[PDB]
Short mmCIF file of N, CA and C and ligand atoms in Angstrom, two decimals:
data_model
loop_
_atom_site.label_atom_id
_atom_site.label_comp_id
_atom_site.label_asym_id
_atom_site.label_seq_id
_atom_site.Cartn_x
_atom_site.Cartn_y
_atom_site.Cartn_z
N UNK A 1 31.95 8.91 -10.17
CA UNK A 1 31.46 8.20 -8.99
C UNK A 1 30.02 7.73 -9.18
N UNK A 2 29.71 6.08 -8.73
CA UNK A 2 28.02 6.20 -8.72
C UNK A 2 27.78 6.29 -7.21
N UNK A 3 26.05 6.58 -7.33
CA UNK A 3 25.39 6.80 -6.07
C UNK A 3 26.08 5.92 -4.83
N UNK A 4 26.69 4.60 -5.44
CA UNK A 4 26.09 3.36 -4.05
C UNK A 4 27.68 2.66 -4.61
N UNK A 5 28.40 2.23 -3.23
CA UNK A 5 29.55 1.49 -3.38
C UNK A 5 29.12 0.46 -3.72
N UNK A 6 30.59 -0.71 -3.80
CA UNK A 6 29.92 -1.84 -3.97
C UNK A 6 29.13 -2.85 -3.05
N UNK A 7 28.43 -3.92 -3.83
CA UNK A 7 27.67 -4.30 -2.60
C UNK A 7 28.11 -5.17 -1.57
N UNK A 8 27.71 -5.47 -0.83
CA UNK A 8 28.38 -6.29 0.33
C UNK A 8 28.32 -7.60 -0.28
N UNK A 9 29.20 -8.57 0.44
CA UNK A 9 29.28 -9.82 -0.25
C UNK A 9 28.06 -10.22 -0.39
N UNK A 10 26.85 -10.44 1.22
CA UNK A 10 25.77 -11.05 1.38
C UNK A 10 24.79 -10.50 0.49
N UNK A 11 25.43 -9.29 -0.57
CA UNK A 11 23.79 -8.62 -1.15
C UNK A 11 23.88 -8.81 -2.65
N UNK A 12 25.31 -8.98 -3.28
CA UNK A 12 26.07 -8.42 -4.64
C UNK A 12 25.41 -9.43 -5.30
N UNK A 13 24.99 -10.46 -5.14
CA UNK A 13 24.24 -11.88 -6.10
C UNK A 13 22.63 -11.44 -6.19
N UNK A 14 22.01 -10.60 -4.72
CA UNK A 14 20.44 -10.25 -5.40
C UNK A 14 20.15 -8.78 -6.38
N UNK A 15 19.23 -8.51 -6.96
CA UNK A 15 18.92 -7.86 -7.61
C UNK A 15 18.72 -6.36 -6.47
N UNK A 16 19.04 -5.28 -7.47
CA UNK A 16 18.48 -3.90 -6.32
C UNK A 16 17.55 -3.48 -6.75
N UNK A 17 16.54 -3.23 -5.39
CA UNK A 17 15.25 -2.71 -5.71
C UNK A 17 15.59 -1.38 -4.81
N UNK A 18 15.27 -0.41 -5.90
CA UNK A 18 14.81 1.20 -5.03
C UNK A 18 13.67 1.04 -4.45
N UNK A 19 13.50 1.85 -3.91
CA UNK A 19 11.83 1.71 -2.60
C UNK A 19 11.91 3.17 -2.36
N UNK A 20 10.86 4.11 -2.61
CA UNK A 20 10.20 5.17 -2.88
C UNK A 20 9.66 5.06 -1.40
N UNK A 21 9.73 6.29 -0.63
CA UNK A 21 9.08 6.49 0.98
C UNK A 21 7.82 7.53 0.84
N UNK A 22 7.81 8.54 0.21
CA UNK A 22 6.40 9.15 0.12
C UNK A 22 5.23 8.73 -0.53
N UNK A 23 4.33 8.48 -0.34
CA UNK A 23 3.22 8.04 -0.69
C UNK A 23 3.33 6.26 -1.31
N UNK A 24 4.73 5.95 -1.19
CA UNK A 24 4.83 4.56 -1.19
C UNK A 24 4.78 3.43 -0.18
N UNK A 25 5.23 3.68 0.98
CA UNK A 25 5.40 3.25 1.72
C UNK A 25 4.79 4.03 3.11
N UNK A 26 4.82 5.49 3.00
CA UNK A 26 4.09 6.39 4.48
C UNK A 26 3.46 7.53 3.69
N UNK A 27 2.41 8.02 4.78
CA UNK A 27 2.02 9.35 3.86
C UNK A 27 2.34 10.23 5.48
N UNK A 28 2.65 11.52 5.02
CA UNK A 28 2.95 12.41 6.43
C UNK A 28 2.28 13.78 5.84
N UNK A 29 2.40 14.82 6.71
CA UNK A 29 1.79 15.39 6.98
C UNK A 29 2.53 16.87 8.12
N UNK A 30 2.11 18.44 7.74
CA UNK A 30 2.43 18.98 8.72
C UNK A 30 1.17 19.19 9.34
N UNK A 31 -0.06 19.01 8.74
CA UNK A 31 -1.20 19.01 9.17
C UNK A 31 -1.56 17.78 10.75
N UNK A 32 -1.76 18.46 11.82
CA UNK A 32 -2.21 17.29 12.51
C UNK A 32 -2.99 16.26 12.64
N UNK A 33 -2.29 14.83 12.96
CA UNK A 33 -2.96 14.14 12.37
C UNK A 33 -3.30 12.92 14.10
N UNK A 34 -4.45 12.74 14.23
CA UNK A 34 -4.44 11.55 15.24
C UNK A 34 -4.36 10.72 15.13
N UNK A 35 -3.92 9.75 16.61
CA UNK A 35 -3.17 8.42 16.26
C UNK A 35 -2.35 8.26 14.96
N UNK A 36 -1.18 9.28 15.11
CA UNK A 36 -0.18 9.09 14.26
C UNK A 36 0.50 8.25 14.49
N UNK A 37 0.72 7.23 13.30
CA UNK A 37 2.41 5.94 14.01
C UNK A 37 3.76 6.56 13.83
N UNK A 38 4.27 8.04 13.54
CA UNK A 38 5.21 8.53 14.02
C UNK A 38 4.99 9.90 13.71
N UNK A 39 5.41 11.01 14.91
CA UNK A 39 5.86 12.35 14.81
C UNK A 39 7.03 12.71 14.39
N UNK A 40 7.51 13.21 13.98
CA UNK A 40 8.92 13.52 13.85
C UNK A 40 9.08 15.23 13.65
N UNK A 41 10.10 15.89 14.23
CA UNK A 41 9.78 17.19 14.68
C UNK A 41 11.57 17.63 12.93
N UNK A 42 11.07 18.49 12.65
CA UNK A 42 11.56 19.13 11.27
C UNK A 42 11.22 20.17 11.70
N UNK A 43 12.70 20.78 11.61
CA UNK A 43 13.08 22.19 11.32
C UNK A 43 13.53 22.77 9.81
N UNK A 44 12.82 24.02 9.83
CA UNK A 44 12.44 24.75 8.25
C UNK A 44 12.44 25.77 8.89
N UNK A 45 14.02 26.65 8.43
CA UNK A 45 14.18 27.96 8.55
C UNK A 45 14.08 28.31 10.08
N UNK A 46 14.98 27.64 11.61
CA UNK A 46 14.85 27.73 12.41
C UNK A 46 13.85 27.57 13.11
N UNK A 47 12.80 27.10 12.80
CA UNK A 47 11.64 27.08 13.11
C UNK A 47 11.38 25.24 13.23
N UNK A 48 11.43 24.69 14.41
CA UNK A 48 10.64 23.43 14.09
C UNK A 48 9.24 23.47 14.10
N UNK A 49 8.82 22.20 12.83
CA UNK A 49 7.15 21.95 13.10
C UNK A 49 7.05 20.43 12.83
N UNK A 50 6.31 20.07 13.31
CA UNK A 50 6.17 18.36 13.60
C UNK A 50 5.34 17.53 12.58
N UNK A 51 5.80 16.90 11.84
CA UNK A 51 5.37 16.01 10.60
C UNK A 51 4.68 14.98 11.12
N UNK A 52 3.48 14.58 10.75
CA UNK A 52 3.09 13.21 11.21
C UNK A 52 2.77 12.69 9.84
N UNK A 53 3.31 11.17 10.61
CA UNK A 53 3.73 10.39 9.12
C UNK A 53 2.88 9.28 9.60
N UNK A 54 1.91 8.41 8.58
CA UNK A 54 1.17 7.38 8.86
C UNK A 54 2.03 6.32 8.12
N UNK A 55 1.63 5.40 8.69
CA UNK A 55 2.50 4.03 7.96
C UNK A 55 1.16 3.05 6.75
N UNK A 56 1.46 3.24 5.72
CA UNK A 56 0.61 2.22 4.43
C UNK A 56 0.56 0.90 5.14
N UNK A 57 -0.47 0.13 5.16
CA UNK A 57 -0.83 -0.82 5.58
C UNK A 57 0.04 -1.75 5.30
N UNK A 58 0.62 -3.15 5.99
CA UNK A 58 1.43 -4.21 5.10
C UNK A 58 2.25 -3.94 5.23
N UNK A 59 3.07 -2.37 5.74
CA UNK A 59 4.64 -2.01 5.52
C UNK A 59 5.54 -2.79 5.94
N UNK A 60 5.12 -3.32 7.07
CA UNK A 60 6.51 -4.19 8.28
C UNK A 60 6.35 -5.07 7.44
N UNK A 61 5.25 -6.31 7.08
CA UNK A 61 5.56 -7.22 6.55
C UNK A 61 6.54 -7.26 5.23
N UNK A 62 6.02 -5.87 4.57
CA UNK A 62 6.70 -5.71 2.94
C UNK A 62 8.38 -5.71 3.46
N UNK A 63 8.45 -4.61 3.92
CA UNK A 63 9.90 -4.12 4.39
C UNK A 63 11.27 -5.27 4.69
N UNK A 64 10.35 -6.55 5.73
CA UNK A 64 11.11 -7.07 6.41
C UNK A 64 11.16 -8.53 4.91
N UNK A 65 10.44 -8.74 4.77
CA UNK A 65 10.54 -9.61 3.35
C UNK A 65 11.48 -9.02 2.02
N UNK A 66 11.12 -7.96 1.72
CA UNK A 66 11.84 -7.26 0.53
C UNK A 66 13.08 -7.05 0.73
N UNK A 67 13.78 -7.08 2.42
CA UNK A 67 15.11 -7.21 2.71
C UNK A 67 15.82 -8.29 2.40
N UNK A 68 15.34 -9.32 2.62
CA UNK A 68 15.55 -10.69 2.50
C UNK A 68 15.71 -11.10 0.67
N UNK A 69 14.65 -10.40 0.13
CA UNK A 69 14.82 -10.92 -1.31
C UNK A 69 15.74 -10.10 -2.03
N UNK A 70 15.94 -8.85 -1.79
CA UNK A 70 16.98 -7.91 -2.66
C UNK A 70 17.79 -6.95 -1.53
N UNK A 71 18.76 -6.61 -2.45
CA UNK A 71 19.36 -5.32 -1.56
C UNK A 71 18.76 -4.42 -2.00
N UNK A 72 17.98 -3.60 -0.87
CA UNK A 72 16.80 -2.64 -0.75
C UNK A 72 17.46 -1.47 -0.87
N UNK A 73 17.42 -0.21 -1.36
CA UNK A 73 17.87 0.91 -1.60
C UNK A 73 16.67 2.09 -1.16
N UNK A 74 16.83 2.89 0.12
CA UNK A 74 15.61 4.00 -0.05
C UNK A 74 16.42 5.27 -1.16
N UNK A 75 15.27 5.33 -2.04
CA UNK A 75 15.27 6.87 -2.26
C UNK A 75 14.39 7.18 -2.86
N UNK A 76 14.51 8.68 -1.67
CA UNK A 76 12.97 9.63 -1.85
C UNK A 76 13.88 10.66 -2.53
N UNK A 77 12.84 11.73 -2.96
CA UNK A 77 13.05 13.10 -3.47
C UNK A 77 13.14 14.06 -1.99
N UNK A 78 12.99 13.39 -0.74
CA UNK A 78 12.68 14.09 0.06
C UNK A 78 14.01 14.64 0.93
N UNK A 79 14.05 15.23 1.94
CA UNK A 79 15.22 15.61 2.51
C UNK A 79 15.96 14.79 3.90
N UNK A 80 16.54 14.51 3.68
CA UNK A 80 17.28 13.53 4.53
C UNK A 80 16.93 13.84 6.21
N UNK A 81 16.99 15.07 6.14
CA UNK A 81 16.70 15.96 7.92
C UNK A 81 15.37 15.29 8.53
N UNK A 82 13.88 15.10 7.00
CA UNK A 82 13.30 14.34 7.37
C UNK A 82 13.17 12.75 7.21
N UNK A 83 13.48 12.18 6.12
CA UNK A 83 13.48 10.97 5.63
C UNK A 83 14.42 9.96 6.66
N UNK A 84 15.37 10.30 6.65
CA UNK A 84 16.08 9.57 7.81
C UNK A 84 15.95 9.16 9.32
N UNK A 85 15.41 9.91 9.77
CA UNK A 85 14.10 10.16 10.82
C UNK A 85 13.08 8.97 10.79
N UNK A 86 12.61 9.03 9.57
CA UNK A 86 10.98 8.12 9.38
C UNK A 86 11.74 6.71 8.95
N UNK A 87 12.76 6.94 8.04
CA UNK A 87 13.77 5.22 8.04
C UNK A 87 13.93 4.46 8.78
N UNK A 88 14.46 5.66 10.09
CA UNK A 88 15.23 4.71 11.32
C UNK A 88 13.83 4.12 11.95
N UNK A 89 12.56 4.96 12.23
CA UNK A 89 11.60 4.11 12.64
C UNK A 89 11.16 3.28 11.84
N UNK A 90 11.02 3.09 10.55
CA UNK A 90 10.64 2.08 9.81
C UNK A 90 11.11 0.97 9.69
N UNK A 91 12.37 1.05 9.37
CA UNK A 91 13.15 -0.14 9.30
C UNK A 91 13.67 -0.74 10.37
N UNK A 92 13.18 -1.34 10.89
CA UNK A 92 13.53 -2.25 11.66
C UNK A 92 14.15 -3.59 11.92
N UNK A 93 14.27 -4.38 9.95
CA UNK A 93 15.22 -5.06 10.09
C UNK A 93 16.56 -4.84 9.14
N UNK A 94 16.78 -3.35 9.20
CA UNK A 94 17.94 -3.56 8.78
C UNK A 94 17.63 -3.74 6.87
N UNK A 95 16.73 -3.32 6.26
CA UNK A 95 16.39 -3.76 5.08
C UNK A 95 17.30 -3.05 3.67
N UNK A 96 16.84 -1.88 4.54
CA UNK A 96 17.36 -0.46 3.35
C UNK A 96 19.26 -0.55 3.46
N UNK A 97 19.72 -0.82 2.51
CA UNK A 97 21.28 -1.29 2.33
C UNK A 97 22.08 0.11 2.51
N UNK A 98 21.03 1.43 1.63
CA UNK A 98 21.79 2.43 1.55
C UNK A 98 20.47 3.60 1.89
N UNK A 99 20.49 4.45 1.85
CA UNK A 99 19.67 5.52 1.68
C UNK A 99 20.60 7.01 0.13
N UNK A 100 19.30 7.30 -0.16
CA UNK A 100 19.73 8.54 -1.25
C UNK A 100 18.51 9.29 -1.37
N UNK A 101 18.57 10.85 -0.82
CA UNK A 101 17.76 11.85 -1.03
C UNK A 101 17.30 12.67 -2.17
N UNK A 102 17.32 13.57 -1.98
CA UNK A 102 16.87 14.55 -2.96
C UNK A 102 17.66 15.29 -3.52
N UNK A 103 19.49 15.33 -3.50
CA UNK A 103 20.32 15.96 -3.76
C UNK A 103 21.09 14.50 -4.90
N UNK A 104 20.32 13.14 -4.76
CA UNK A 104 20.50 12.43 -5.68
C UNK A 104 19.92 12.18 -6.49
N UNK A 105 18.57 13.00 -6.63
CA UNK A 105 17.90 13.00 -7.76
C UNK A 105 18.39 13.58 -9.21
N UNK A 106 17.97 13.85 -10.19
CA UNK A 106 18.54 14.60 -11.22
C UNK A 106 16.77 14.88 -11.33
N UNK A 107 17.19 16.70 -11.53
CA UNK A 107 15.99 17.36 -11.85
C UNK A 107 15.97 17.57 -13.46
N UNK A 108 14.61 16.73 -13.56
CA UNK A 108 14.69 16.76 -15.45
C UNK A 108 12.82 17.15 -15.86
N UNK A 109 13.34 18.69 -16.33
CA UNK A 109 11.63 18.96 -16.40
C UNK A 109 10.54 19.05 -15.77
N UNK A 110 11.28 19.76 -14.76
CA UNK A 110 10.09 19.97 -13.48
C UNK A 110 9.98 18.89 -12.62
N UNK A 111 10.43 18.07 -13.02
CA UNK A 111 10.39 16.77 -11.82
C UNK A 111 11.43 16.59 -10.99
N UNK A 112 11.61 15.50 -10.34
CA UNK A 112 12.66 14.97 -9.53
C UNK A 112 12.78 13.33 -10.12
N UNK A 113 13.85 12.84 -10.98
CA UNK A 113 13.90 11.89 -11.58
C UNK A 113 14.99 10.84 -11.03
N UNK A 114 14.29 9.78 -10.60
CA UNK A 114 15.87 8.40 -10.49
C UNK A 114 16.22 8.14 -10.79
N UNK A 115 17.52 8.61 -11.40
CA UNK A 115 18.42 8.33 -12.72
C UNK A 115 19.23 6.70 -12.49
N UNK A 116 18.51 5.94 -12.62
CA UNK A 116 18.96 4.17 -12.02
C UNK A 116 20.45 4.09 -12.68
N UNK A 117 20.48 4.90 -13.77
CA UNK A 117 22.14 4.59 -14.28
C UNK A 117 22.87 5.35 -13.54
N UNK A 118 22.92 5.77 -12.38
CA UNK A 118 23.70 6.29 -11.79
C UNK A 118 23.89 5.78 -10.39
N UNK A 119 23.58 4.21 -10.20
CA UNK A 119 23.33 4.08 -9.11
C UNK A 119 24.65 2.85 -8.88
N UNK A 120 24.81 2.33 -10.39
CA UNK A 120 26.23 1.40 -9.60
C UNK A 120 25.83 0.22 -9.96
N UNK A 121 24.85 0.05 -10.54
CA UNK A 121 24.33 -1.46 -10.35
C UNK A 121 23.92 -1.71 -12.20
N UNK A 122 24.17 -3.25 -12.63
CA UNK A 122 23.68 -4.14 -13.57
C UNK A 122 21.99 -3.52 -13.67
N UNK A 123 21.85 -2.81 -14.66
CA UNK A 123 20.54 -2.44 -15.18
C UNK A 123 19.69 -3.63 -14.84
N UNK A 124 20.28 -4.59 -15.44
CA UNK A 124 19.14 -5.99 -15.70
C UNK A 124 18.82 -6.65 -14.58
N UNK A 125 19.69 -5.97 -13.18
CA UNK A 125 19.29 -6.22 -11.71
C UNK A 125 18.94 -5.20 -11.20
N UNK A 126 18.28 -4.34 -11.92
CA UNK A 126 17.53 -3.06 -10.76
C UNK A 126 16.07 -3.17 -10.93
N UNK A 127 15.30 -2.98 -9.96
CA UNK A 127 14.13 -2.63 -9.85
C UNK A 127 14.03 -0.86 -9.28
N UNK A 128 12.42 -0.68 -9.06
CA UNK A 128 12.14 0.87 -8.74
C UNK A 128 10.88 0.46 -8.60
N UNK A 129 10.49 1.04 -7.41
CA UNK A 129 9.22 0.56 -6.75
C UNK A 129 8.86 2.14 -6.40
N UNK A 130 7.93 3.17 -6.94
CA UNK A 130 7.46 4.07 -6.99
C UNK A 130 6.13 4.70 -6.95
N UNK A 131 5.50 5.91 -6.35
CA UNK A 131 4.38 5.78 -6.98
C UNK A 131 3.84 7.29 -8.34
N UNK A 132 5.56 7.60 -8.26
CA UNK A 132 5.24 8.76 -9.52
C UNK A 132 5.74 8.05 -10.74
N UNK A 133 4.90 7.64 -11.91
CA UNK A 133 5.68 7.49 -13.13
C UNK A 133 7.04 8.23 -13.30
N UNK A 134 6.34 9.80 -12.51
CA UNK A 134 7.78 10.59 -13.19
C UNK A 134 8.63 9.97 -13.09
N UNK A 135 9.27 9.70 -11.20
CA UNK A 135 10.47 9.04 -11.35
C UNK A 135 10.93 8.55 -12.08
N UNK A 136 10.55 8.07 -12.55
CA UNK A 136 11.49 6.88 -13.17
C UNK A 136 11.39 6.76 -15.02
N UNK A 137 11.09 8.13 -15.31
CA UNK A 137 10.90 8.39 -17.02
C UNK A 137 12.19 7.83 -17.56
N UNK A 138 13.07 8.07 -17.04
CA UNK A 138 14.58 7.32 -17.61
C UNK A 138 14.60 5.76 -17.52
N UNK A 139 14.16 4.73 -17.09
CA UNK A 139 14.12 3.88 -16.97
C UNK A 139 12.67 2.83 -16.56
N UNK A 140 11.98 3.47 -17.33
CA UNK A 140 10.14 2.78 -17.40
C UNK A 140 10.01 0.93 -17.30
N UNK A 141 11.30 0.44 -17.81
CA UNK A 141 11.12 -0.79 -17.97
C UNK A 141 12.19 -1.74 -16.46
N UNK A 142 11.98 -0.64 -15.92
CA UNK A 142 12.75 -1.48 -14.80
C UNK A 142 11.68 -0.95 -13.52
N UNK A 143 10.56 -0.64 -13.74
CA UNK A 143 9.62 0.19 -13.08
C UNK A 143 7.96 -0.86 -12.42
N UNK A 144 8.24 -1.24 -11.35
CA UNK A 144 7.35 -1.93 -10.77
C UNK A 144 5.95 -0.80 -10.17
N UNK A 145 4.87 -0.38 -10.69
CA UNK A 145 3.99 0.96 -9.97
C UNK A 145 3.46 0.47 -8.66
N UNK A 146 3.36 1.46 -8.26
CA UNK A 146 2.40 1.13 -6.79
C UNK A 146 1.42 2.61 -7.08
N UNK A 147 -0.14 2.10 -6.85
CA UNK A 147 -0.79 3.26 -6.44
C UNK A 147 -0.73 4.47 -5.30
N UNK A 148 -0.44 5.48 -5.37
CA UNK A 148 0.10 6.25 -4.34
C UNK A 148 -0.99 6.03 -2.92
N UNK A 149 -0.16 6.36 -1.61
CA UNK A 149 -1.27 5.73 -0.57
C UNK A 149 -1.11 7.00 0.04
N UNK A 150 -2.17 7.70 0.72
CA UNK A 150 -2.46 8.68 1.99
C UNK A 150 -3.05 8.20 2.72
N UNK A 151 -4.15 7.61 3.12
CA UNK A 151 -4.98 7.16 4.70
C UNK A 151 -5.37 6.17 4.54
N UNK A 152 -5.84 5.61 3.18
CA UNK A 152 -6.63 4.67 2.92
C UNK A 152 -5.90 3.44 3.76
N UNK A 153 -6.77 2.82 4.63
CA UNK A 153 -6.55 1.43 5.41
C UNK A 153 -6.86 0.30 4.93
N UNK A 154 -7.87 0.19 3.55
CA UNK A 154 -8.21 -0.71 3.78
C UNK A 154 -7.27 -0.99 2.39
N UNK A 155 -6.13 -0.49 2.05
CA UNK A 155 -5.25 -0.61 1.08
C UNK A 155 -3.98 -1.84 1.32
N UNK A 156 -4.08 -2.75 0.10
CA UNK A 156 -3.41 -3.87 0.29
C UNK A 156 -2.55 -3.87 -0.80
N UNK A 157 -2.10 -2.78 -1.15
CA UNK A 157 -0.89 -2.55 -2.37
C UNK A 157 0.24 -3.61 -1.96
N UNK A 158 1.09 -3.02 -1.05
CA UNK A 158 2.09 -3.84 -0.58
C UNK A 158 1.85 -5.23 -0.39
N UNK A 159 0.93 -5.56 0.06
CA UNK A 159 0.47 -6.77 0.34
C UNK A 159 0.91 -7.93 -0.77
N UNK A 160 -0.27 -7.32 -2.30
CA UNK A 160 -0.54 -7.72 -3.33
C UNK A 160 0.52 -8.07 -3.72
N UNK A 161 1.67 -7.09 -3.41
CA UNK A 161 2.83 -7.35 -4.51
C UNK A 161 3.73 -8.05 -4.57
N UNK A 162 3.45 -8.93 -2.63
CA UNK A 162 5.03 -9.90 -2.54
C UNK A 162 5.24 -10.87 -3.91
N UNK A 163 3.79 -11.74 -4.13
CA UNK A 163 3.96 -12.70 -4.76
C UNK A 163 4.54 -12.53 -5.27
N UNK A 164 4.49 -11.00 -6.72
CA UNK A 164 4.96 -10.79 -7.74
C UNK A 164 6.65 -10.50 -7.53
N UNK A 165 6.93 -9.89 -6.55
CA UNK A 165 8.42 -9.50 -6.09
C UNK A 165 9.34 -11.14 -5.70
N UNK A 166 8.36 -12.15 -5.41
CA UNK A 166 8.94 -13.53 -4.82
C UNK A 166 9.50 -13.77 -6.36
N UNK A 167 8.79 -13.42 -7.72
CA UNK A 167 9.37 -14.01 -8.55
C UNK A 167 10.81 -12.89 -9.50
N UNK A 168 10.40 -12.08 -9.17
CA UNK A 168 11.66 -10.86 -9.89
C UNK A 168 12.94 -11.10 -8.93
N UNK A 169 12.45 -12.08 -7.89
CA UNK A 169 14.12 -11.53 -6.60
C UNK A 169 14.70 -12.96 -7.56
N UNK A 170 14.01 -13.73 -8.04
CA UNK A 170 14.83 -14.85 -8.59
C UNK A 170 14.87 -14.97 -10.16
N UNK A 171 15.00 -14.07 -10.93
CA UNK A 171 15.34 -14.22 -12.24
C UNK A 171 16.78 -13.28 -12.53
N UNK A 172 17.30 -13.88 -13.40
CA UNK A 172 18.81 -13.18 -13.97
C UNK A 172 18.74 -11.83 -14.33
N UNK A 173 17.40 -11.55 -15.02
CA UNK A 173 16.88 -10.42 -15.99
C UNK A 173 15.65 -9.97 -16.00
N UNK A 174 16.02 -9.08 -15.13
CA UNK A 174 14.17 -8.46 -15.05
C UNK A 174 13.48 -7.70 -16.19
N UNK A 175 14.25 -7.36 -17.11
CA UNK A 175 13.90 -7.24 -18.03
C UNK A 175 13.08 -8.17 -18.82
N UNK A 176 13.37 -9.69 -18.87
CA UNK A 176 13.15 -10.96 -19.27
C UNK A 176 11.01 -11.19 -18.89
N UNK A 177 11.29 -9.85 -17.55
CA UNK A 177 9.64 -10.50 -17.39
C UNK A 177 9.16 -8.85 -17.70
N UNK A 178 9.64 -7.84 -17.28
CA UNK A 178 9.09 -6.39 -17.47
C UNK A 178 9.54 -6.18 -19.07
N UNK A 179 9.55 -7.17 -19.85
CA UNK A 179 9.60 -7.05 -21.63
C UNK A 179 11.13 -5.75 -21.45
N UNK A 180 12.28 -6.34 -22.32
CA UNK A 180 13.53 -5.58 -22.49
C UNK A 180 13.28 -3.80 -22.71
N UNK B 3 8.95 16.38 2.82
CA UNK B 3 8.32 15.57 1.97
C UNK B 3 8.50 15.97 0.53
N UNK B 4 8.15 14.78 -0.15
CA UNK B 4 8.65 14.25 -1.50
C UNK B 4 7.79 14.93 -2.36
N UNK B 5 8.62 16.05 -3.07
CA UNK B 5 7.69 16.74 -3.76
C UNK B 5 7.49 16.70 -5.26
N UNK B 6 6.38 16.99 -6.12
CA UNK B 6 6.52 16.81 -7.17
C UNK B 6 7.74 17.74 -7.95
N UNK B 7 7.66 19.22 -7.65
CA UNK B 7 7.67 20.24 -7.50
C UNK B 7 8.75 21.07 -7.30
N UNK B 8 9.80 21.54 -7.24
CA UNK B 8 10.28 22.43 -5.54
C UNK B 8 9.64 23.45 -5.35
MG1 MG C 1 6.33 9.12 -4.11
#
């Protein structure tokens, strides 16, 4: 079996980009945090305690564009009880095609790794938008970086990167520009 | 959250 059925008619012609949620897209927190743009209450061991998750600058714009250019895939290393939670507020148009946690990772060497060959999809149409190298040690050349984000506002990662993503949603082979 | 770690 891979991770992800097949794709829907409207998605199976663009390329799939994974999209990384911790420190890629939100940074959270059990530490309290003010003017949080979402709480979300997580239970650990019967016990709830309330995560506040900030949103990386640029996100709505990135999110709602990056839907449009690829079929968007979330996956974190993180746990669905919380990640799914912070999705449903994030996404708002419907971007993320599928979601895959932390029970779809493959643990290789202390890490938590995205094994992209296991996801269903034409190598030469996947992307991985991350901000741990680790991830993605199995597949480096299909690997777009983002600097990891926690508070910083005046951070325009996402921003920076449509241009570059306007041109990977339209080539055959992303390999062709991230060198084979 | 997304750990390096477990
Ligand atoms: Mg991360």
């Amino acid at each position: 079996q891979y991770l992800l059925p097949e794709a829907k008619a409207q998605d199976s012609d663009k390329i799939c980009v994974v999209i990384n949620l911790d420190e890629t897209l939100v940074h959270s927190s059990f530490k309290p945090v003010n003017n949080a743009d979402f709480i979300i209450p997580v239970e650990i061991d019967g016990v709830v305690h309330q995560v506040y998750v900030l949103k990386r600058p640029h996100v709505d714009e990135f999110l709602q564009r990056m839907g449009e250019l690829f079929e968007c895939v979330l996956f974190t290393a993180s746990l669905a009880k919380y990640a799914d939670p912070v999705a449903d507020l994030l996404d708002k148009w419907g971007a993320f095609r599928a979601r895959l946690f932390r029970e779809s990772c493959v643990f290789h060497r202390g890490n938590y790794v995205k094994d992209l060959s296991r996801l269903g999809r034409d190598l030469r149409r996947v992307l991985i938008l991350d901000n741990s190298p680790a991830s993605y040690v199995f597949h480096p050349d299909n690997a777009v970086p983002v600097a990891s984000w926690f508070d910083n506002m005046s951070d325009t990662e996402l921003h920076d990167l449509l241009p570059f993503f306007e041109q990977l949603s339209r080539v055959d082979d992303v390999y062709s520009v991230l060198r084979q | 959250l997304s750990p390096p770690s477990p």
